[PDB]
Amino acid sequence: FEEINDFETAFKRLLNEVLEFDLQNPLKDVKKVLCIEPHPDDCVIGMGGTIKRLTDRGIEVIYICMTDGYMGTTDENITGHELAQIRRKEEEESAKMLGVKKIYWLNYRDTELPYSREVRKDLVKIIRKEKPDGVFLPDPWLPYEAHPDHRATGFLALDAVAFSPLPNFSNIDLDIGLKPHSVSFIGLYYTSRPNYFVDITDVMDLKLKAIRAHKSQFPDDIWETWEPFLRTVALYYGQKAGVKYAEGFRIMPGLFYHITPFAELI
Amino acid sequence: FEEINDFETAFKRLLNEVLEFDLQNPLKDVKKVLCIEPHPDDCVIGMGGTIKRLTDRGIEVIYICMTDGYMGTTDENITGHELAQIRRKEEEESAKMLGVKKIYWLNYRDTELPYSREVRKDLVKIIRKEKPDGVFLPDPWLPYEAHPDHRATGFLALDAVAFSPLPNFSNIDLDIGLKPHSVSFIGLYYTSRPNYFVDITDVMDLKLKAIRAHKSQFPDDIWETWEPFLRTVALYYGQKAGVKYAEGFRIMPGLFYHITPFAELI
Amino acid sequence: FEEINDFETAFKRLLNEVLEFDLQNPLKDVKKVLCIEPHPDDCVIGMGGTIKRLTDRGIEVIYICMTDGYMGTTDENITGHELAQIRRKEEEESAKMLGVKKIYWLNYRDTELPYSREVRKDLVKIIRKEKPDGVFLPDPWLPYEAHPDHRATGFLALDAVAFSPLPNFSNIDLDIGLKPHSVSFIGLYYTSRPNYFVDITDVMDLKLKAIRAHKSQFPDDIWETWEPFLRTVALYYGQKAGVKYAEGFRIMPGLFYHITPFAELI
Amino acid sequence: FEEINDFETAFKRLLNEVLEFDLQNPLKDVKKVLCIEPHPDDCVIGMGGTIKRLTDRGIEVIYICMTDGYMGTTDENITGHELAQIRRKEEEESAKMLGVKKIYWLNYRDTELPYSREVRKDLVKIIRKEKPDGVFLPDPWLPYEAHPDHRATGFLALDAVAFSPLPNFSNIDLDIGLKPHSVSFIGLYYTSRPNYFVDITDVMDLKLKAIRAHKSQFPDDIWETWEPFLRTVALYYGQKAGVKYAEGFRIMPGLFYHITPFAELI
Amino acid sequence: FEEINDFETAFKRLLNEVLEFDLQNPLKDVKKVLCIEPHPDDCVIGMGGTIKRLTDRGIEVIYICMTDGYMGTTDENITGHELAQIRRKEEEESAKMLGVKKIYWLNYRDTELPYSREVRKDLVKIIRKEKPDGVFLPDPWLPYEAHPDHRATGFLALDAVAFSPLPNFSNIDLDIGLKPHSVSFIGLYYTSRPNYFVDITDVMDLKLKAIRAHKSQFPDDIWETWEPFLRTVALYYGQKAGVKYAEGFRIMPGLFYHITPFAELI
Amino acid sequence: FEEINDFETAFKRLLNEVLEFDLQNPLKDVKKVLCIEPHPDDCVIGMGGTIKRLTDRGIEVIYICMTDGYMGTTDENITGHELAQIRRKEEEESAKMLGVKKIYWLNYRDTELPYSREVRKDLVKIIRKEKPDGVFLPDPWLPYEAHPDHRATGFLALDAVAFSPLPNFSNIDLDIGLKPHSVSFIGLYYTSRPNYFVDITDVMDLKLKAIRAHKSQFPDDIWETWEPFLRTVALYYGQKAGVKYAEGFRIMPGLFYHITPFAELI
Ligand SMILES: [Cl-]
Ligand SMILES: [Cl-]
Ligand SMILES: [Cl-]
Ligand SMILES: [Cl-]
Ligand SMILES: [Zn+2]
Ligand SMILES: [Zn+2]
Ligand SMILES: [Zn+2]
Ligand SMILES: [Zn+2]
Ligand SMILES: [Zn+2]
Ligand SMILES: [Zn+2]
């Protein structure tokens, strides 16, 4: 590689020959994935269509939900305890409509999710137990994301995936018979720099039915705003992918999440 | 909205019809605003002109100052306790010169402002009490902002505004008779992605006199650097707005601060 | 400066006359610098070539390593305690090969570096003791940096530099006879927005030998991936600087790290 | 007082003349008290009889409950969210049976109550709003108390009472129009060093009915153990007070909670 | 129990009939116990003899060590990383000499053991996996215990035992197939209020050989002080039990660790 | 020591021969001591008399004050910043009246002193710099001490003394040329289990003048209560020592602060 005198060549060779990074079929071998959502309803809102598509193709999809959704209401007659119970039933209904069979609830309180070692260990435990091929998580670099649970979940999910294979990390996991694990695939959903698209034209009406199942979050008057907003998001991704309705994801080789100044160039 | 096949149309309709988002007069009905500053002098440096303009138009402007300014000196003869006392008198003088009548001091120590639930609750209490129509806060995504108190204040102010209307958030506030509150208007000051401008050509000399009132922060020799820097900032904003001297703000609909991949497009 | 009617003029004058900012020879008077690395091997990987060039020019280079490298292995036979010992010897060998004489080990555990006042005070102590002219640190705004130790180190280094000269900050340092200190020079390594380059075509094979000295981190099979990745990075910086192999740095005047909306413009 | 040469005399004079400390009728003027409980059911279990006696005498009793009781079950079919909802209804029933009209729920999670400034501020807010004459709280020095929520509540309640009257403590409370407040009376319940007793012979069957109202906590099989345990506690206090069934409290002058080496002598 | 009019009767019946509390053989059915030690060497120093006695009787003894022993040296030539490696080998040798076959290392750093939910979860995981009949832990109420790791370990071990059987506590443990678990037996070692004794006259020379195996901690000159100190401790316990050399333990019914004012009476 | 068959003998030998523990003159070689106080005025109130006696005997006494005294007023007209300034001047006057030359201010805020590694390191730095022979600190086991700053200071002081001599603890101190340090002498003031007394009948009126110097803390009406309280405390210690007025201290050999079940027996 000392032979090479020009960046684009080196870059092309690094990606294509050295890393063998494929953006055309990057879910080739994947049989099990984790979707990590900050609140009940985030998996379905950000990639509900893709989830349905994967379950139909007989890929096993497992949700990890970081919080209980305790705060998500303006109704003074509903306690956070009542609302958590409700949003558990709602995500159970929603997850059944897409093919999703298992949900792990971390049960950190909505608005109170720590960026801490503790939460890294909670995720690394599940990854080591379920040995998934791929993990989906919200992009922590989404510009203007003011929800701290969202930002946190992103960094934690990356940290967890990064540390799952390190046997000195959360070592009691090994001592009780969980083996360390490398994930093959990482995809960021809720991203503004997607580089992989999935047509959801055919499943858009199911996706919206699975979102609406979260009745607590979507009364008629809120739905007036959110059905348009969601169709607009699907068109934004759609236009880039040459279809009506798409879901955007950012997929990179693991190496590019660390000390890569040209990471923004894929 | 199923009717729509292209993004730009959907985008235009979302902004114009669904959200009714106005960049021509977004302060229409605003009678009271909060300006949140990390240190004494930040409201005046970032939007002192706009504050004067608002008070002249008979709009009530209330400062929330996050810290005491304990660290802001190189003089070995001044203790942090002395400096805090001084910077309280300075901001009191400065605030009088602009039309500003109330300041809340959180009194967290300069350089030690936590990114915590506690501080969210301190802000949400004031918002519920003062029921402001609009809130101004420093842009936390300002590139190359190395002051941790600045970054923190931005995220906290957004969190506070987002959570003020949720009755299960800091619920003791309700139990002692503070009602939940929605803010109509959010504006980010100290931003590099402004999309709303205020002419301060006419109030620039008052703005500089109100900055200079912070004598502790601005001895003659420091002022040699800072009067130029401030004129340059006002020109940068000015050029974009077609005037000599402007203050820039980023204003978006509340919806766009959460899971909006096209947020950077306004 | 009231005279000026256009931004670009004011900008040019602010940079050239007021701030005297020089990008052609910014290491004029620099005799002593600190290189702050999150892990053992980060100084060598991010600016090993530049460090050699500085040593040869008789500039004193001191490493501060934030963590012990406890987690950096997939081998189930190596404890984090064994690995820390090993990576100490490796960085000692690597530091010998470049001209580096002194290493401070903070010994926070890999993956567990706090963003806290405590760690700010640990750095400020070293800066006040060594009174360095310049500090190098990894760019905390590097896009897609998922390693929390990296993000943390960047913000802490800037905080430390900013607070070293404040006598009310960590005041016990003064009480035991460490004087406050201003550093002249700040340079961000591992950056995607570099604006200063150093030719390392001549030292590239030494740099790779000094990286390979970290045997724990770079077995044959991993080096198949990392020798290409590093040549590609050096070309990326190289293309921008018009040479084969360069190391990129971002250098700005201290003022631009605070409330500067045109900071992105240098 | 320089006249005095013997401790017992000075001690007697300090208590009787200087402090005017009365153990015979120490609730003389009290019209409003707060009972602070770590979990739902702690007020009723530790002093349910005394509460009834006070409400019958037309004294206003307000509960502050620190936690939600999320963890208090071995039943794998009940979520912490369900159980919190349930224990809210149970304490509402229980509190109605005794004369208690108002409950504030802090809603910190069972087993997760922090010993933090935040929680001190939550209590000081309620004290300043309700201006109670007296506060009851569990004795933090109860030997062999392994429940961390119990230990925590005790220290926090004392801290809160101590800091309620300090206008520089949680100063935003004052800024929104809560005046500082001194409590006249402090009583520790769940104590092993009681020095004031209340006959509950006449209300013991109501106390047990109000405990049993917490059905979640007291199934038939658990009640086999807890009816005896509670009768035994009431006899232990009873024997000391010369009655069948009593509730023990430790009452001291505020001064004795700080730097008093003979505090254990009342 | 309404029948009873005097405490001593009720107390006797509570202990003997209701709780069936046995101080003659409280290890009756115990096949597996956990010994929790703050540092390498604490299990052997506090109850090494008892451990030997248990392994000879074919009872399975598992150590949980909370910290790595990083700080335990005055030798400036030994890093904390070197010392941890050493103290791992030492406790492995020591544990072999007593019958002990499993050690779990939490690897929190010596002097830095947090009193946190995280550490509770680490212990509860091991308890649920190993389903021990009994747990030994240092008495957190030991007067004049200044080592914060000691105090912490005590409270944490009690918390862990208390919370192991609650399915809503660390619920991910259940989701990955660890069942909740109740411990039958709790014994506090390093206690000044022991109420159960074990003769170690016959195993005292093995106990001292197993202590001495921690060479790092016990050079000749330190052993001059510690062999006497240990013989003195064994006599103190011995005198109370009517033997030369004993190890003291405090054993109570689980009920007495919560809201029991007469707990100090057994 | 195998020879010995009885505890009291072993105990006597351990104390007298092995540990050489002297309660008759335990300040033999002491030339320099630290007095650690949680608030300004705690050294003077707890051992002001003893301090004068030590100064007169030409022993160097250095105050470490943990907090700034920010909260200590009921006056709504005084800010915590004003009060800290004032209490600095007051402790400077008070310290002059006794022979005290040097005060280190940690400047943690009153009511907000952390029990953290950070604060341990702040104390260990001062101890290593001043190499004192002895340290005085408030007894953290003082029954009914409700002030969290007091409890915290005690544990921190002991931790600091324990860890000062460990070169792997706060190792950057060594890297900047502070040597590790063992203190010879530890004495607990504000204790209810004193075992060493100092006659202060001769200095009692100076002690009261040095307390009264803290005017902020002691207006006429408060002094009506505090002059009696202090005379009573001095008599309590006095009676035990067979004098009118004494100051009590608890002194033990360093070994007894760790795993010593008979520590209560001296
Ligand atoms: Cl662990
Ligand atoms: Cl497709
Ligand atoms: Cl506050
Ligand atoms: Cl009565
Ligand atoms: Zn969400
Ligand atoms: Zn600022
Ligand atoms: Zn690194
Ligand atoms: Zn309870
Ligand atoms: Zn230990
Ligand atoms: Zn005090």
Residue numbers in the entry:
A (entry chain A), B (entry chain B), C (entry chain C), D (entry chain A), E (entry chain B), F (entry chain C): 2 to 267
Manuscript text:
Deacetylase from the extremophile Pyrococcus chitonophagus has been analyzed by X-ray crystallography, small-angle X-ray scattering, differential scanning calorimetry, isothermal titration calorimetry and NMR to determine its structure, thermodynamics and enzymatic properties. It is a hexameric, zinc-containing metalloenzyme that retains its structural integrity up to temperatures slightly exceeding 100 °C. It removes the acetyl group specifically from the non-reducing end of the sugar substrate. Pch-Dac crystallizes as ‘a dimer of trimers’, with two doughnut-shaped trimers stacked back-to-back along a molecular three-fold axis, with a 8–10 Å channel through the middle of this assembly.
Three crystal forms were analyzed, including monoclinic crystals of the protein-substrate complex (Pch-Dac-lig), having two protein hexamers in the crystal’s asymmetric unit and trigonal crystals of the unliganded protein (Pch-Dac), having half a hexamer in the asymmetric unit, with the other half being related by the crystallographic two-fold axis. In Pch-Dac and Pch-Dac-anom, there was no ligand in the substrate-binding sites and the coordination sphere of Zn2+ consists of the three conserved His-Asp-His residues and a single water molecule that occupies the same position as the carbonyl oxygen of the substrate’s N-acetyl group in the Pch-Dac-lig complex. Thus, with or without the substrate, the Zn2+ cation is coordinated tetrahedrally. Three of its ligands are provided by the protein’s conserved His-Asp-His triad and the fourth, in an unliganded structure, is a single water molecule wedged between two catalytic residues, His259* and Asp42. Two neighboring Pch-Dac hexamers had been extracted from the trigonal crystal lattice and used to improve the curve fitting. The same hexameric assembly is observed regardless of crystal packing and probably represents the biologically relevant oligomeric form of the enzyme.
